[PDB]
Design a protein around this ligand. Structure first.
Ligand SMILES: [Cl-]
Ligand SMILES: [Cl-]
Ligand SMILES: [Cl-]
Length: 163
């Protein structure tokens, strides 16, 4: 575990992370995809061997010894708000199980279902709160990666609020 487990946020490409493993915002079919998923495919293509997994689950595949945790958030275009909310919470719970199983001291994580799977809605708070629910009981240093300047400020505020 980390000596003083923390949350941090950085506004940069998660493919350039300084953590011991990465969470991919994957699609269920293990396809190269768009956004975070395409950056992850370019950086760690070997990790897409048998990475297909259902919505609401996470499947880890090693790129060398570097773990890529493929976490499949729901696409809110297809799911009801209710069912999507349940699957998004479940995906993060499976990420926490994988991070724990791997014994890493740090993890790089995007906000699941906030980009092309958001169904055109702002889900910063929904996705971040489900991240916290899952990861709060883990002792890994969590580093959240985002691309928008205003999102960085809002995520930083939410982290600092809890102290
Ligand atoms: Cl960057
Ligand atoms: Cl997304
Ligand atoms: Cl963002």
């Amino acid at each position: 575990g980390a000596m003083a487990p923390s949350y941090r946020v950085k506004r940069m490409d998660i493919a350039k992370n300084d953590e011991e493993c990465v969470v991919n915002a994957a699609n269920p079919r293990g396809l190269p995809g768009d956004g975070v998923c395409k950056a992850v495919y370019k950086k760690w293509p070997e990790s897409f061997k048998n990475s297909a997994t259902p919505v609401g689950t996470a499947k880890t595949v090693m790129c060398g010894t570097y773990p890529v945790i493929h976490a499949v958030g729901p696409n809110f275009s297809n799911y009801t708000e209710s069912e999507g909310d349940r699957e998004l919470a479940a995906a993060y719970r499976e990420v926490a199980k994988e991070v724990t199983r791997l014994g890493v001291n740090s993890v790089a994580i995007p906000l699941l279902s906030t980009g092309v799977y958001s169904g055109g809605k702002d889900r910063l708070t929904q996705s971040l709160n489900h991240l916290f629910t899952a990861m709060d009981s883990t002792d890994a240093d969590v580093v959240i990666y985002c691309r928008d300047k205003e999102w960085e400020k809002k995520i930083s505020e939410a982290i600092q609020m809890r102290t």
